[PDB]
Design a protein around this ligand. Structure first.
Ligand SMILES: CC(C)(COP(=O)(O)OP(=O)(O)OC[C@H]1O[C@@H](n2cnc3c(N)ncnc32)[C@H](O)[C@H]1OP(=O)(O)O)[C@@H](O)C(=O)NCCC(=O)NCCS
Length: 159
């Protein structure tokens, strides 16, 4: 059975491995690899929070979130990343992560906002399905694999 829980310091090896199997030029414009033990600790030590999903105390999903801006005028906007293990997808894990996340931040923020590469077909469908709004589209933001990719900006009304 599947459980969601706070990420442990001792879980970081696994989160690194999972993320680095997950990120491709299809879903991020940053150079690869994006994850490392020390990058993840840096984040952990600067207030980014991590939800993790396990199946037999094996990590199969991860969601990190944090304030979008470090200054007060923008402090009411939260952002997040999420990665589900390829073999474990389409089983409700993403949904369940997003759902507890939303209930964490409900109280403390007004608005969720994320950036999605237009090449990220499953993310596009995922976010629409979970009720996010397509707020903006930035045209030809990135060149990846000989294609011009757009940046789709999705938001969520915490209210
Ligand atoms: C996007 C992602 C997190 C969704 O993970 P998930 O656990 O497989 O999603 P869920 O099982 O919770 O599904 C909720 C839903 O997502 C949709 N969706 C997710 N993947 C889809 C796909 N490959 N094709 C069509 N619809 C899809 C649904 O249609 C939906 O409802 P349903 O499953 O009852 O049909 C997963 O694909 C992911 O890991 N992508 C890898 C890289 C990434 O993270 N992209 C951007 C996030 S920063």
């Amino acid at each position: 059975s599947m459980k969601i829980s706070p990420m442990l310091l001792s879980d970081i090896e696994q989160v690194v491995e999972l993320e680095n199997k997950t990120w491709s030029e299809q879903n991020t414009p940053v150079p690869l690899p994006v994850a490392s033990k020390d990058q993840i600790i840096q984040k952990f030590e600067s207030n980014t929070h991590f939800l993790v999903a396990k199946i037999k105390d094996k990590i199969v999903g991860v969601l990190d979130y944090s304030s979008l801006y470090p200054f007060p005028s923008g402090q009411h906007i939260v952002t997040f990343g999420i990665a589900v293990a390829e073999k474990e997808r389409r089983k409700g894990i993403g949904r369940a992560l997003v759902q507890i996340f939303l209930n964490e931040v409900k109280s403390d923020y007004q608005k969720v906002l994320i950036h999605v590469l237009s090449s990220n077909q499953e993310a596009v469908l995922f976010y629409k399905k979970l009720g996010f709004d397509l707020e903006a589209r930035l045209t030809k933001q990135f060149f990846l694999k000989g294609q011009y990719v757009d940046d789709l900006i999705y938001s969520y009304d915490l209210e």
